[PDB]
């Protein structure tokens, strides 16, 4: 779990767009059709998305390109 989101905040620094990005990632991982890109340690989807953001592996641009690639595949 993440007691503080400062590490995730400095990756995409707005403290406001981070909430939207994490909400989108958590929605993807929760409603189905997605699997976590970071090892899952019994914690909920919110902190998984936050840790993916903090590790620098999830961002808005790459989320958009992944959605575009999924649309192109279908």
């Amino acid at each position: 779990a993440r007691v503080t989101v400062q590490d995730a905040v400095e990756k995409i620094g707005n403290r406001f767009d981070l909430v939207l990005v994490a909400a989108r990632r958590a929605r993807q991982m929760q409603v189905g059709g997605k699997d976590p890109l970071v090892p899952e340690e019994n914690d909920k989807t919110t902190v998984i998305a936050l840790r993916e953001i903090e590790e620098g592996l999830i961002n808005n641009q790459i989320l958009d390109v992944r959605e575009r690639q999924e649309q192109q595949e279908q």
Partner: protein, 49 residues
């Protein structure tokens, strides 16, 4: 190296935040409160007549 009278401790936390960041200052605040409680209890400070 002071008496830490309710103001030096506040400045301690402020300098820790300014220089180190947020996670170190949160851990520092938790440790400060733990050790302060423990040693205040050990001191046995009591008010008498």
């Amino acid at each position: 190296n002071q008496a830490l009278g309710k103001k030096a401790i506040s400045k301690m936390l402020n300098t820790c935040y300014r220089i180190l960041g947020l996670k170190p200052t949160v851990i520092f605040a938790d440790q400060i409160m733990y050790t302060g409680f423990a040693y205040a209890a050990r001191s046995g400070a009591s008010v008498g007549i």
